[PDB]
Amino acid sequence: QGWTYGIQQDVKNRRNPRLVPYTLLDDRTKKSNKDSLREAVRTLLGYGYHLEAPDQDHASRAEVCSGTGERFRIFRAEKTYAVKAGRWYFEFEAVTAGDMRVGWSRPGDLELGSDDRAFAFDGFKAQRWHQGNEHYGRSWQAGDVVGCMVDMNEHTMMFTLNGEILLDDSGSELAFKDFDVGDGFIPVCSLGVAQVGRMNFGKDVSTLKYFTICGLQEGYEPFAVNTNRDITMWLSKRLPQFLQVPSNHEHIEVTRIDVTQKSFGSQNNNTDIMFYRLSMPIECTYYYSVRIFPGQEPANVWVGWITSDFHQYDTGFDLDVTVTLGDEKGKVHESIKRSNPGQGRNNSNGLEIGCVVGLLTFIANGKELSTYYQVEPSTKLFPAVFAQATSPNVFQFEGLFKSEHKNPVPQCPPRLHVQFL
Amino acid sequence: GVEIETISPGDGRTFPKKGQTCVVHYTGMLQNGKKFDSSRDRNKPFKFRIGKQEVIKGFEEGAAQMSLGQRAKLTCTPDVAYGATGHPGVIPPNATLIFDVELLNLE
């Protein structure tokens, strides 16, 4: 209807707080009616009503509970601040509890103890974490120092909870033991969402809460006892970017061979999505391909020429800038630059062609599908297309297109230059 | 040409004349926003007179098309700037230009 809510005019005034439901309101806006309702339903108990609640163990139907793993910010310190010898110790308070585990990492999304590059133990469950699960010590809550520590020479990893050295099922001080030093071990803190921590490496022995008990007399050192500076921290981040060459994925390979060709592809069921960004922008109608195996849509692909900015690797598909000039009137003008497909194949059906002169036509397999835009002030690009498949031979990768990236002219044959990775 | 644009003008009247050291604190730029010059960081205001042919004519025409106290966004072209030769080692061939000019005084 729009009772006092007509957004354009609001012909009748006196909007009220009640328009948003009683989730916002409370018994102060319900004492008049709810007492009558409660008297009525009490007399309906007088009728003899029978109704147990649905969300109880008795009437067992509450089956909409499950964990939510997301933004496990693995806080850290600098690799350069690593340690490979001597006794070290550092405290860690806690404002809450939850899926929240700390310890010692190694320089190497996968949480602590899932692989052989970190040692840690939880408080939600009181169990060790190194390449598996193992019970240890005791849980905690708010206002609980953990006080992890190592003796790097003889491998005595311990955790001192307000002076309490925590022990395993066998009742032993040494939680972890017999670890090779290698590239040292650095502090680390994992935190699921709606969990909070606060750390104190060695910044002030006064600010250290419980260090004189079990850290001072044992020859165990703070981290920042000598550093006259802000020791640094960093964390597993949200956006994806380009730094590394894998060559060690689930199963995907890189090479180059003559029109060009490479060698690629997995077998594990790639229900999820992948990433890519070529290292070298090569340069020496303009037909040149980029082939990918799953053709005639084993999974429906979504080809879109796109710039640097992204934020998502999930199934949020079909959710993607225009000049509109005014003349002191409001009527738009000069709207020619605006908004600054779903088919490819390799094996089953085709390939994916590039084109150049400003002028562009990215369409697969030589068939007109009405490309719309030709917008480019300037966009540096290496190829990056990402999609699903049913996992047959899951990926591949193939003047010409190698002409509009650098200063030489369009020329077909690209020559030998020692970097092509 | 010098397609002048203003940013925070002042009087709009005190235009320059011949033999007038335009005391500028400019901050040049390039297309694609790749910076190539400055004066704010040096803390050394530029100084040049009119008609002496010291500077490229873009700055001279921009000053003649400018009043005192007038922050601006000039826009030169290769015709007035270094052209298809280009200033070597800094400017490439056939480069448009941007300048966050700010005139202060005349002596």
Add this chain to the structure above:
Amino acid sequence: LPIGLNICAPGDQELIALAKNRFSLKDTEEEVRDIILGIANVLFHLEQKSKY
């Protein structure tokens, strides 16, 4: 308190000076553990020293 520290440390120290090692202690602790293995006097000595 250091007075209480010296109070609890002296008795345990006199205990540990005699209870360091004994073959009779080994056999008697083995018989007791099989009936009910020596008690952890070193653990309690460390627990006292951590406070002291």
Add this chain to the structure above:
Amino acid sequence: NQHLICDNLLPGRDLLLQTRLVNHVSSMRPNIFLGVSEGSAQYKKWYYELMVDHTEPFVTAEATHLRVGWASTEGYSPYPGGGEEWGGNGVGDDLFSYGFDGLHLWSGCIARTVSSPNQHLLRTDDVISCCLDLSAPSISFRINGQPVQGMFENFNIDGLFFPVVSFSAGIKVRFLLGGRHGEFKFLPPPGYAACYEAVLPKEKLKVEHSREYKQERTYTRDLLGPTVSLTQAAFTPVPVD
């Protein structure tokens, strides 16, 4: 031969290499969430104002920063550093965006002229108003009550966005929302609303600094963990039906 070759390596200049140090800025917002899901809408026309005093480089470079044009957080996040758009870690950074700073909209370093007489920056004592337009994007601002035409189409409002303000150093301004705290010198025009209507209980609304990871901590280093938003489940309020 050295001077020959030294003067020969330079003028290639595709070899030559570029850096550009940047002013350090930070965003800000009020405690309001947009939260407008389609189906149980509340107010698709909001209005709030901002009032300023000083924007001077007293000992700084004059390359300052002040914008209010809304950005796509489907395109942007509250981080302190990064991005190939010369950083400038604030509002209007992401290419699917714009930004109102008195004279122009720099759509990810793409200058787009705005239609307004008396073009000038957000100088001392100059008010900045905001409005809302979704179903056909022509999102309006005004400066001291004068026609800011040529508003923006095709910025991605596929769903919602987030309310923002960004500023560099050497700045001193004041929000205006309502009550005592909004002395609206230019009232809501027809079909709008002074945007202090979702003042929810359990807290007086205030600023939030765009879900910062850590402020200037002093006691120790506080790993203020993941608080993704008001709701880990989603970004939406609950009309019960």
